[PDB]
């Protein structure tokens, strides 16, 4: 029962949140959040390549 949240340091999420907070416009904030989300999704795809039924999701970060 592998989970992506078991591989993601909390420091990465904290740094992303700090960058979002210390940004001027909506574009930059959305950009940082989107970068984090895309990295998470790509890692999810890599990790669960063989498994069939997966309950993993973005919930731990959301």
């Amino acid at each position: 029962s592998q989970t992506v949240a078991s591989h993601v340091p909390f420091a990465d999420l904290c740094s992303t949140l700090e960058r979002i907070q210390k940004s001027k416009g909506r574009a930059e904030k959305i950009r940082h959040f989107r970068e984090f989300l895309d990295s998470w999704r790509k890692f999810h795809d890599a990790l669960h390549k063989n498994h069939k039924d997966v309950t993993d999701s973005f919930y731990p970060a959301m």
Binding site: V4, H7, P9, F36, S39, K42, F43, A46
Partner: peptide, 26 residues
Amino acid sequence: MSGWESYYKTSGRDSLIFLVDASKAM
């Protein structure tokens, strides 16, 4: 697996305010 380290990789108008000095010297 390559690990999480690989995937993350870490108009307008002008305003002017004159400021004169009302001292005895001036």
